[PDB]
């Protein structure tokens, strides 16, 4: 069980750790989060009480280093940093734990929700989508644009998701225009899976990362990417049985976790109606279709 200590909390903030959230008051003796499960990526995220503009946060994996949070009064944000001195770090964490100045990652023993949202998400793949190679953790916020959004502006602060575009020469083989537009199997299986992702695990990891940035930060480009990657599968007549069954599970947990009050801004009516009711895979997503029809019958 790993720990992300905080130097202090000088500004009132809502702190997210994965799907959990805690309100901290201005100058409250909050010194961090303990008992963080090893084996998963994690996201620690922030919304300031005095300016809800900019949700921002840090993707990290405690296996890769010792990370802490320190408020920067110049840049006005809680920053993640790495502590290279193992013994200094262990000594700080022991003191804060002894004085019970840390909140406990509040995982229920039965509860596989975080595993189920992050099954395919790996820190090494996050670090290729979010490029800042001097840090082992990745900063994301509300306003960061995608490479595809910047094509349609600062490249260093961009989300480098895989560009998916149904009306592109990459998506459409010369001489198979109708075939490739109406059945995206070529684009899914040869171009994206064999060509770019190498396997369904990397494809699912990107889809799951896109959903979590959409949900936790309200990142609009992330929401577009999540829907494009769902639509590419649902619009393909030929998909491996194992990929369809896994996609059903992935989407079920995403729809289960989504706050009901955010469904109107996070779910695209066109894409979900098309995927569940018109697409080649309209009858392949049993679990997802059932939770969508019971939780969000309005959207459909």
């Amino acid at each position: 069980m790993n720990t992300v200590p905080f130097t202090s909390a000088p500004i009132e903030v809502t702190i997210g750790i994965d799907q959990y959230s805690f309100n901290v008051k201005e100058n409250q003796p909050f010194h961090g989060i303990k008992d963080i499960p090893i084996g998963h990526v994690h996201v620690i995220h922030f919304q300031h009480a005095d300016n809800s503009s900019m949700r921002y946060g840090y993707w990290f994996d405690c296996r890769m280093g010792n990370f802490y949070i320190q408020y920067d009064p110049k840049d006005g944000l809680y920053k993640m940093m790495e502590e290279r001195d193992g013994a200094k770090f262990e000594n700080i964490v022991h003191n804060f734990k002894e004085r019970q100045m840390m909140v406990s990652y509040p995982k229920i023993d039965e509860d596989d929700t975080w595993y189920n949202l992050t099954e395919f998400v790996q820190m090494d793949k996050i670090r290729k989508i979010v490029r800042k190679d001097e840090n082992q953790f990745s900063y994301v916020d509300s306003s960061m644009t995608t490479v595809q959004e910047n094509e349609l502006s600062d490249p260093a602060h961009s989300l480098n998701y895989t560009v998916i575009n149904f009306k592109s020469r990459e998506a459409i083989r010369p001489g198979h225009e109708m075939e490739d537009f109406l059945d995206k199997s070529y684009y899914l299986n040869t171009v994206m899976l064999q060509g770019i992702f190498k396997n369904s695990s990397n494809y699912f990891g990107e889809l799951q990362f896109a959903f979590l940035n959409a949900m936790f930060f309200g990142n609009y480009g992330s929401s577009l990417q999540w829907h494009a990657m769902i639509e590419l599968i649902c619009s393909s007549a030929t998909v491996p049985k194992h990929m369809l069954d896994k996609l059903d599970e992935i989407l079920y947990y995403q729809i289960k976790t989504l706050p009901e009050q955010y469904s109107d801004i996070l779910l695209n009516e066109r894409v979900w109606n098309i995927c569940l009711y018109s697409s080649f895979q309209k009858n392949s997503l049993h679990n997802t279709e059932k939770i969508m029809e019971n939780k969000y019958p309005e959207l459909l």
Partner: protein
Amino acid sequence: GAMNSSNYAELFNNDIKLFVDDTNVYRVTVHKTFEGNVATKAINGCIFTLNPKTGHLFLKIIHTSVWAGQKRLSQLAKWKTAEEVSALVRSLPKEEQPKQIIVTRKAMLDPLEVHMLDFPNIAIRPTELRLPFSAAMSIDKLSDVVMKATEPQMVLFNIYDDWLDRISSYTAFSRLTLLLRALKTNEESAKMILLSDPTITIKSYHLWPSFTDEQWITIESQMRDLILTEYGRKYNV
């Protein structure tokens, strides 16, 4: 974006453009089978691809053989239209290629956009205009070349005959649309108006009769009266 009454002069500027109408590509007769079920029999069709400034009509004849053993023909017909327009553009010298292609039906936008990905500088647009190009098969010489075709064929016409010697493109297009609207509304009455005086003939190299300027004004009036007469008949107004 979409072409309407707000930007109507754009049709007659010096930017090469084509209208594409797919409404006569897939044509069928519906009939009873021996067992009392219903079946369709395809007949020859055509793509109507028109430069509104020059009058040049690229009439691609669609022979019934292109449907043989194909499914979902109304869907395939849009993609075959887009394939043929794409092939026509690639066949033209660069200086003759259009800068814009306007489709008369929105259902042609995605098929044409996908076939023309190699031509990112050619704009594919819809139109808010209700154009009567479906009535092209009411022009006897165009109907004749389509129905006689035994194989796929492209035929080039000038749909304005020699009118651009005497009138602007704007006026020629207005005359064409009024003639086609009348032929679409009441074909028999329109053809009666065009052919009722034997002394005015259609030249071998023309589609329409050889009307003088004064005779065209009379014809245009009779066509407007036909459209208004039919509108009164339809709506009992």
